[PDB]
Amino acid sequence: QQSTFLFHDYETFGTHPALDRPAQFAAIRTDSEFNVIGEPEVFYCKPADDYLPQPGAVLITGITPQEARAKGENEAAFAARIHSLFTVPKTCILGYNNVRFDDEVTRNIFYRNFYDPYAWSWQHDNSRWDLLDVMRACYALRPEGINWPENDDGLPSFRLEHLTKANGIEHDAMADVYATIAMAKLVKTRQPRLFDYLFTHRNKHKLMALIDVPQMKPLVHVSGMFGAWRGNTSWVAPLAWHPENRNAVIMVDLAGDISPLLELDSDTLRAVPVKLVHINKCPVLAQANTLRPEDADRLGINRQHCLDNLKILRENPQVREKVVAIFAESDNVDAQLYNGFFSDADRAAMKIVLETEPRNLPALDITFVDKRIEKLLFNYRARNFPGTLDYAEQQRWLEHRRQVFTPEFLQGYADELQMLVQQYADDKEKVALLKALWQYADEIVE
Ligand SMILES: [Mg+2]
């Protein structure tokens, strides 16, 4: 294989990557230089009948539940197609905001449909990357040559549509994917060394090399959690590694007020200028001098304050033990991805479910230990393969739907639609989508 990039993007029916359902996936493969080498891959996911989309999401995407249902395949087949693209060897799977959103959608789709939620991103020399934190890093650290738009609040905006507009990039189903490729080419051209640096440091071992806990060696870190008001940037120092999470290091934000850290106990601590950096999540980290004096000035970052805090922290190493202590501590199976890793035996069993013909599942005679699996398998069969359900199973599914579609939920859904149709009365496209959402809800739930 040669190294490739797979740019992708989901449209979904709501904001929650587990509890809302996907609507559409789009992707295209490029070579290592961002030349398109594949065909556009665009397809839909039929939503199961235990779900109503968030009206807000449909207003954004323009994709109705009727359209995804008519054009889509079941989530099992949707998952299969995405897994086949993602597991091509030597693929860097990337998008725009995928680390915090799309990748969580992928993990949950794989989880619900009996794929490994994690292996795709690293096996066969694969990786992931995310152009959102690349753009944020450019603004903070190397803003030359790119136009940086402000939003209506007066803050720098990193919405993809704003950055393409501001930089002369033309921006159907493939719009977002092609815009993301355009942004990658933009940074590679205008900030070549930073682009190379950020690409190389997507690798967790390269990130590890930057981390010197004994010395509390300061680093620049660009993170959306720091806020657009300071260009999402600060100087941080590593205090300790997370006592449970092998991939998380506990950083102190040196720009913060460290008083609570010094003069408060770990229980009270559990603002507090502590954050986890997850080395498997493409965090932006670099040597402290990567943030140049002019840019620190521009972003309002106070170097002396950071250095004074760093000095205090180094002179008080008992703070390390303190922060380690901080981190030393629903019944919906769809929400339970992070309730733990499955055992080896359970993954083996789940693989048999995956590789068994849907018509043969009712007679499958395997054993699971993890308590999530019985429910995962029932939902998987009832959502994807409802013609294979026996009478008792149909009754179970009917009860499931009744438990989702509570009186409070249905009333609130009707209320939201009626509110939105008044609010958007002058937008004829939106009014039409809302009427479609009402009609779908009438069919599914009333
Ligand atoms: Mg997106």
Curated annotation (Swiss-Prot):
Domain Exonuclease: 7-182
Residues involved in Mg(2+) 2 binding: 11, 176
Record's keyword terms, sorted: DNA damage, DNA repair, DNA-binding, Exonuclease, Hydrolase, Magnesium, Metal-binding, Nuclease, Zinc
Co-factor note (free text): Binds 2 Mg(2+) ions per monomer.
Coiled-coil segments: none
Occurrences of domain ExoI C-terminal (ranges): 330-445
Pfam family, one: RNase_T
Site location (Important for interaction with ssb): 142, 197, 287, 314
Effect of residue 295 to A: 2-fold reduced ssb-binding. No effect on ssb-dependent nuclease activity
Notes on activation and inhibition: Inhibited by 10 mM EDTA.
InterPro entries: Exodeoxyribonuclease_I, EXOI_C, EXOI_SH3, EXOI_SH3_sf, Exonuc_1_C, Exonuclease_RNaseT/DNA_pol3, Oligoribonuclease, RNaseH-like_sf
Cofactor: Mg(2+)
Binding site for substrate: 11, 159
Domain notes: The N-terminal exonuclease domain and the exonuclease C-terminal domain form a central positively charged groove which binds the DNA.
Task performed by this protein: Degrades single-stranded DNA (ssDNA) in a highly processive manner. Also functions as a DNA deoxyribophosphodiesterase that releases deoxyribose-phosphate moieties following the cleavage of DNA at an apurinic/apyrimidinic (AP) site by either an AP endonuclease or AP lyase.
Name recorded for this polypeptide: Exodeoxyribonuclease I
